[PDB]
Design an enzyme around this catalytic site. Structure first.
Site, PDB file in Angstrom:
ATOM      1  N   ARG A   1      11.673  -2.124   4.579  1.00 37.71           N
ATOM      2  CA  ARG A   1      12.070  -0.718   4.606  1.00 37.71           C
ATOM      3  C   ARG A   1      13.571  -0.565   4.698  1.00 37.71           C
ATOM      4  O   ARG A   1      14.090   0.508   4.381  1.00 37.71           O
ATOM      5  CB  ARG A   1      11.398   0.012   5.768  1.00 37.71           C
ATOM      6  CG  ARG A   1      11.763  -0.569   7.107  1.00 37.71           C
ATOM      7  CD  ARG A   1      11.029   0.127   8.255  1.00 37.71           C
ATOM      8  NE  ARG A   1      11.297  -0.581   9.505  1.00 37.71           N
ATOM      9  CZ  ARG A   1      10.664  -1.685   9.883  1.00 37.71           C
ATOM     10  NH1 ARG A   1       9.668  -2.190   9.172  1.00 37.71           N
ATOM     11  NH2 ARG A   1      11.045  -2.302  10.996  1.00 37.71           N
ATOM     12  N   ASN A   2      14.274  -1.621   5.115  1.00 36.59           N
ATOM     13  CA  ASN A   2      15.724  -1.626   5.265  1.00 36.59           C
ATOM     14  C   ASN A   2      16.424  -2.441   4.186  1.00 36.59           C
ATOM     15  O   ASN A   2      17.535  -2.938   4.408  1.00 36.59           O
ATOM     16  CB  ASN A   2      16.115  -2.130   6.659  1.00 36.59           C
ATOM     17  CG  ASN A   2      15.962  -1.043   7.694  1.00 36.59           C
ATOM     18  OD1 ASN A   2      16.147   0.127   7.370  1.00 36.59           O
ATOM     19  ND2 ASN A   2      15.601  -1.404   8.929  1.00 36.59           N
TER      20      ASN A   2
ATOM     21  N   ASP B   1      21.877  -0.909   6.201  1.00 37.38           N
ATOM     22  CA  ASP B   1      21.825  -0.424   7.584  1.00 37.38           C
ATOM     23  C   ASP B   1      21.876  -1.561   8.599  1.00 37.38           C
ATOM     24  O   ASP B   1      21.318  -1.451   9.692  1.00 37.38           O
ATOM     25  CB  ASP B   1      20.587   0.452   7.807  1.00 37.38           C
ATOM     26  CG  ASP B   1      20.696   1.794   7.082  1.00 37.38           C
ATOM     27  OD1 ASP B   1      21.783   2.078   6.532  1.00 37.38           O
ATOM     28  OD2 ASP B   1      19.699   2.542   7.029  1.00 37.38           O
TER      29      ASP B   1
END
Ligand SMILES: CN1CCN(C(=O)[C@H]2CCc3c([nH]c4c(C(N)=O)cc(F)c(N5CCC[C@@H](N6CCN(C)C6=O)C5)c34)C2)CC1
Ligand SMILES: [Cl-]
Length: 270
Positions: A137-138, A151
């Protein structure tokens, strides 16, 4: 400028073009800088981030530079809310991308996804910079299908208690080694463990790890020795790589330099 000159970005150079959705800090937009260069614009919901500490850390982040790292261009802080301006990744987050069955990925592509991420994490490791929330997801995917880590280190500035507590509903329990869940022992080796789970996500085409278990059951079982099964698409040699990230003893886990070398070995057999 964008990655050049002042990293305080003049919001009058930004044109908002499309809504990308909302993430951990709220609204994300696609736009252009000075009408020509694509940017993503993260608008930081007030009360969601430790802004002073983040802005100080942003100086360090501006000095990181790697092809496989989503570039931080700068910040817009003379206004409410503040903006974070980054490299634009047209294909969105790696997790959603994996889950789009239309791509009909070859395993050669999946392996290179792992290589892109591992290169970025080798760079961060050489800089003694922990990611602390590595997961599909990152990661982001650009228009050329290149995967980049995004991130990095930002979890340190999240104010949401459900994300900060190791038993909160938003903590990355399924990407955490036992020494994190039991003792809050973070290290390069907890990033290593998360990279293994990330390889598993990629070779599982985005399935949620330990899906049959709740967050609590997962924490208890991995600390006893439960491990993720080999995904159908992963060969034995690929699974050995992800498995090696999950040693119960952190110092028996490899470095990202070793993992990259292992991934290249498999790639070079093609
Ligand atoms: C129709 N065309 C225009 C837009 N298209 C996309 O695919 C966009 C998807 C989201 C997204 C894109 N870029 C980015 C960047 C960036 N630095 O560029 C940073 C982000 F922080 C994004 N997100 C915000 C919401 C939550 C999450 N989500 C939620 C759902 N999702 C896929 C995702 O990534 C992440 C996106 C591209 C398709 C092609
Ligand atoms: Cl599978």
């Amino acid at each position: 400028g964008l990655g050049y000159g002042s990293w305080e970005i003049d919001p009058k150079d930004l044109t908002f073009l499309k809504e990308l959705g909302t993430g951990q800090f709220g609204v994300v937009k696609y736009g252009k800088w000075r009408g020509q260069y694509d940017v993503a614009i993260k608008m930081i919901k007030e009360g969601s981030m430790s802004e002073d500490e983040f802005i100080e850390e942003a100086k360090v982040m501006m000095n990181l530079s790697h092809e496989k790292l989503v570039q931080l261009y700068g910040v817009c802080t003379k206004q409410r809310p503040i903006f974070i301006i980054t490299e634009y990744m047209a294909n969105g987050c790696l997790l959603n991308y994996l889950r789009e069955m239309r791509h009909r990925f070859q395993t050669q592509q999946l392996l290179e996804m792992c290589k892109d991420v591992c290169e970025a994490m080798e760079y961060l490791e050489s800089k003694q910079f922990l990611h602390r929330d590595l997961a599909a997801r990152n990661c982001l995917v650009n228009d050329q299908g290149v995967v980049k880590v995004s991130d990095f280190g930002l979890s340190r500035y999240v104010l949401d208690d459900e994300y900060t507590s190791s038993v909160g509903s938003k903590f990355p329990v399924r990407w955490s080694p036992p020494e994190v869940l039991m003792y809050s022992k973070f290290s390069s080796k907890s990033d290593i463990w998360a990279f293994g789970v990330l390889m598993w996500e990629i070779y599982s085409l985005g399935k949620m790890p330990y899906e049959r278990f709740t967050n609590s059951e997962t924490a208890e079982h991995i600390a006893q020795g439960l491990r993720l099964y080999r995904p159908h698409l992963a060969s034995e040699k690929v699974y050995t790589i992800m498995y090696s990230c999950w040693h119960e003893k952190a110092d028996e886990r490899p470095t990202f330099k070793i993992l990259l070398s292992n991934i290249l070995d498999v790639m070079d057999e093609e």
